[PDB]
Design a protein around this ligand. Structure first.
Ligand SMILES: *[C@@H]1O[C@H](CO)[C@@H](O[C@@H]2O[C@H](CO)[C@@H](O)[C@H](O)[C@H]2NC(C)=O)[C@H](O)[C@H]1NC(C)=O
Ligand SMILES: *[C@@H]1O[C@H](CO)[C@@H](O[C@@H]2O[C@H](CO)[C@@H](O)[C@H](O)[C@H]2NC(C)=O)[C@H](O)[C@H]1NC(C)=O
Ligand SMILES: *[C@@H]1O[C@H](CO)[C@@H](O[C@@H]2O[C@H](CO)[C@@H](O)[C@H](O)[C@H]2NC(C)=O)[C@H](O)[C@H]1NC(C)=O
Ligand SMILES: *[C@@H]1O[C@H](CO)[C@@H](O[C@@H]2O[C@H](CO)[C@@H](O)[C@H](O)[C@H]2NC(C)=O)[C@H](O)[C@H]1NC(C)=O
Ligand SMILES: *[C@@H]1O[C@H](CO)[C@@H](O[C@@H]2O[C@H](CO)[C@@H](O)[C@H](O)[C@H]2NC(C)=O)[C@H](O)[C@H]1NC(C)=O
Ligand SMILES: *[C@@H]1O[C@H](CO)[C@@H](O[C@@H]2O[C@H](CO)[C@@H](O)[C@H](O)[C@H]2NC(C)=O)[C@H](O)[C@H]1NC(C)=O
Ligand code: NAG
Ligand code: NAG
Lengths: 463, 49, 463
């Protein structure tokens, strides 16, 4: 059996310390290893849409209630109108979002897409294997519509416990979602086909139509990885990428917080409905929560007083319920706005912002359908095995001080490589790997006091 | 009913909820203890007084 | 008699398909036609400011209720303080917004501004005709302050129907806006004066002070349209631009959703006031809604049983009202932050982000005053008549593998034009406009296996 619990300090991970510099040169920390990795997000975009019959929830059509209820008929109009407006807003948010989701053009989707990349996201020509993993992990009750009601009716299982068939007692109405799931799948298949061309300008209206792998290498030069490294490691890179991708099949656990958020969204909807159901049994001190009971046990002068008490508490619950829905609907709208922005930034293009997307610079990200929302995945780049090297602010001709250069997307380093006779070398900002200094890796700059005075050999300028 | 809910003779176009069918009720079903029997059987035997 | 409604499938537009190709060259989609167009948005920035009198709303000078009310005097104090804080927040948001609206410097504005561009937005020196069209289309009640109180009084028409005269019955007070519409007009003209322009670096210090048309051409070259095309089509551009602008006269319709939102901002304010007014007549089971009436009809020991019922329900309505106002006030503040952000991005500069602004890349946008907020218009660039062409990743000298170039903000395509003897031609990325390849449109790059091997005539490098 288990022993005693252990009190423990919370660990503090210290940053790697990088001693500063007090001259014309400085230590530079650069990774020598890296790995792909993935992060995930869930953004809700909707609230389930419901309406409530304002006569049926309060009473079961017993006539005495129908008479008394006329005094309160205007409250019901306010209830129905408010819910109706909330539902309209949910539909507008969907239409607005999809207008930005669609692309004017896309690649056709084929099997074997992406070359050496595994791409389990490809459609089973359908939704996707990953989306189905998510939906199977979801615990949500079976839908209605068709066959709907005849799954509630006596010709069906005695074991049904769905709030969905309780809908036909309580006066609840669960509205159908605005969009057929197949059209939703079409919208995200279009996003898959919107990858490439990712670079070459903003891409506003041209479509490069190039292989997925090629768009990746372009992105890798976009983060300061030199081309020489990329050409040598192409298969290695694809393999590391696929290992990160393969982990997605194990990502659906309760320890995955994005996954957990999906689960909560599902039970936010379920919880609201169950609350209204429980209130049907809630006597307010009325002789019974049932109208028929109080009718059968009371002389009518007494009976109506008890009915009124019952009605008043029932209406109060409905009013509180409406307010609850208005709050949730608004938060969903705001969340949907966030999703829209990420699709037009984090998904459609590589971004330099940081913050957003995965916490590892940024490379391609993907999005899939999820209940009540969109589920995002971001591929990220994670540095490792950092080393410190000597580096210089720039170089100049000692004999001609006006000739000064500085590295582009990388740093000048003292060479530590046996293939380079030159005392200095160039490496990319994202990855350690020396290279000879050439005009392609540098630009001319105004002279500065911290630039090295080179008395020997520089090829850019040769003189 | 829709017009009355908006107090108007011109409701904006849309899809709107209306009250549900209350269904239909059938003839009653009742179960209660039975077999009372009033013990009158002594009249059927022997000589009456 | 009209036909029966028709059931129909929801259409799904399919993106233009572009088949992926293998090897060193690829298919490219480019528009051959375009049009200007506009989109609009309404961002609310404020809630109308009101205050109430927990001494005039509950009861009206009856001495009996005043004494009863004293036991509850602290509720009014909480009500008044809460409303007061809400109003302070509204004024904070106004000042904060204006702080970004103002510019350190601007151009003077005269009629005929913008040259061939029509610019209907110019003031009738004034506000603007466009702002006035909006105000005319809005159904809002006649304005407060002057003459005010004398439109409640018999010195006016019997046909007045303003809730504003009911302001002096209900104890409502409507606070004046802080901004003063004349100062508001000055601020929007100042934004127009910042036009021409943002281009030319940061634009955060200097003021370019150039003609409007020039700033437009600059933006057009900022989206990959070649300079040569711009010089040839200058009048055409202005014509298409003014067609899009002319459509704004039809923009004030109920199908314009931005317009619809403006109307609902007005509607929401009116509804809140009407709610409090209707409650003045709401008995709470009290014999009458009038306090003086129940006083007149009842002996004082019983009289205040009725008064008590009435007071408590009136207080309850006020409490609910305050809570609603606090919520709305907060949503307005957040909305105002968004407005401020767009002023400092969508308006003050061209943006590369997509997302924000209308969906047609981005080109200059404008903003005008609208009730309780700002109304934005976004000019945009919509592509048309896309064609498919052959293109190459880059070019190199077959005689020397280190001579490799790639297009800048454009593509190398196989020539299809009789003017160019060269087998390849440069094009703008926003429009199909092939041209000879020259050093101005290209850059040297590291070699790659997909670059074409040109064994003959390449001018950049000549050798
Ligand atoms: C450094 O790069 C190597 C690739 O050569 C990474 O891969 C690890 O290699 C060792 C060698 O036996 C394996 O045991 C590990 O399982 C590999 N890691 C994997 C597959 O994730 C290595 O991870 C990199 N270093 C760090 C710290 O990440
Ligand atoms: C890419 O990943 C897919 C994931 O579907 C792999 O296919 C699975 O491979 C395992 C290996 O034992 C099988 O057990 C599964 O049945 C396979 N699933 C399907 C749907 O076929 C695939 O092998 C991977 N390929 C590469 C090249 O990495
Ligand atoms: C070598 O030293 C530095 C670069 O390492 C060059 O810059 C000058 O440094 C002196 C300090 O002795 C400063 O006073 C000057 O202002 C620097 N020059 C400029 C333009 O700012 C120096 O020119 C180099 N060459 C020599 C000493 O011949
Ligand atoms: C580019 O397309 C536009 C519209 O698609 C063409 O504009 C014409 O505009 C007039 C005025 O409204 C219409 O009556 C014509 O029907 C339009 N023509 C067509 C074919 O739609 C414009 O001429 C085209 N420009 C080109 C092809 O260079
Ligand atoms: C362009 O500006 C001109 C003014 O320079 C506008 O023309 C006026 O429009 C108003 C509105 O209908 C008319 O009352 C005036 O009579 C017009 N002026 C003249 C001289 O006729 C015009 O509306 C603006 N827009 C376009 C698209 O041309
Ligand atoms: C001519 O084009 C080919 C491909 O179209 C260039 O690429 C070579 O391709 C082979 C096959 O993979 C590689 O083994 C070579 O290493 C590639 N060349 C280089 C420099 O990497 C080829 O370079 C072109 N020839 C030139 C430019 O002279
Ligand atoms: C930087 O150089 C040395 C480092 O040991 C230090 O003593 C010195 O005060 C620093 N500053 C300057 C201006 O040299
Ligand atoms: C097409 O691309 C594949 C990618 O694996 C490559 O192996 C092949 O050489 C290319 N060309 C042809 C003609 O298949």
């Amino acid at each position: 059996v288990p022993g005693e619990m252990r009190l423990a300090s919370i660990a503090f991970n210290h940053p790697i310390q990088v001693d500063q510099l007090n001259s014309s040169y400085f230590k530079l920390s650069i990774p020598t290893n890296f790995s792909f990795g993935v992060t995930q997000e869930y953004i809700q975009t909707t609230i389930q849409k419901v309406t409530v019959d304002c006569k049926q929830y309060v009473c079961n059509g017993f006539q005495k209630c129908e008479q008394l209820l006329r005094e309160y008929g205007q409250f019901c109009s306010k209830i129905n109108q408010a819910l109706h407006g909330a539902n309209l807003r949910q539909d507008d948010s969907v239409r607005n979002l999809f207008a930005s989701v669609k692309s004017s053009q896309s690649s056709p989707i084929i099997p074997g897409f992406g070359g050496d990349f595994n791409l389990t996201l490809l459609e089973p020509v359908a939704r996707s294997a990953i989306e189905d993993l998510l939906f199977d992990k979801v615990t949500i009750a079976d839908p209605g519509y068709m066959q709907g009601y005849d799954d509630c009716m006596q010709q069906g299982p005695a074991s049904a416990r769905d709030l969905i068939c309780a809908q036909y007692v309580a006066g609840y109405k669960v509205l159908p979602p605005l969009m057929d799931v197949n059209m939703e799948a079409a919208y995200t298949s279009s996003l898959l086909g919107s990858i490439a061309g990712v670079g070459w300008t903003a891409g506003l209206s041209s479509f490069a139509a190039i292989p997925f792998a090629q768009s990746i290498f372009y992105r890798l030069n976009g983060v300061g990885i030199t081309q020489q490294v990329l050409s040598e490691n192409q298969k290695l890179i694809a393999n590391k990428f696929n290992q990160a991708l393969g982990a997605m099949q194990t990502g659906f656990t309760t320890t995955n917080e994005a996954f957990h958020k999906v689960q909560d969204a599902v039970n936010n909807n379920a919880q609201a409905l169950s609350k209204l159901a429980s209130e049907l049994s809630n006597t307010f001190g009325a002789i019974s929560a049932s109208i028929g009971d109080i009718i059968q046990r009371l002389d009518p002068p007494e009976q109506d007083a008890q009915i009124d008490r019952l009605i008043n508490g029932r209406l109060t619950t409905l009013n509180a319920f409406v307010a609850q829905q208005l709050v949730r609907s608004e938060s969903a709208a705001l969340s949907a706005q966030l999703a829209k922005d990420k699709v037009n930034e984090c998904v459609k293009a590589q971004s330099k912002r940081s913050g957003f997307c995965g916490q590892g610079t940024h490379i391609v990200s993907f999005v899939v359908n999820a209940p009540n929302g969109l589920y995002f995945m971001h591929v990220g780049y994670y540095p490792s095995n950092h080393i410190e090297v000597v580096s210089a602010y720039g170089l100049c001709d000692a004999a001609n001080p006006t000739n000064c250069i500085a590295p582009v997307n990388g740093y000048f380093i003292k060479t530590n490589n046996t293939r380079i006779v030159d005392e200095w070398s160039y490496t990319g900002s994202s990855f350690y790997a020396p290279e000879p200094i050439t005009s392609l890796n540098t630009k001319y700059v105004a002279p500065q006091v911290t630039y090295q005075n080179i008395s020997t050999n520089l090829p850019p300028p040769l003189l | 009913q829709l017009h009355c809910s908006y107090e108007s003779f011109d409701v904006e176009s849309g899809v709107y909820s209306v009250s549900s069918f209350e269904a239909k009720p059938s003839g009653s079903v009742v179960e209660q203890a039975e077999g009372v029997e009033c013990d009158f059987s002594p009249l059927l035997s022997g000589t009456p007084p």
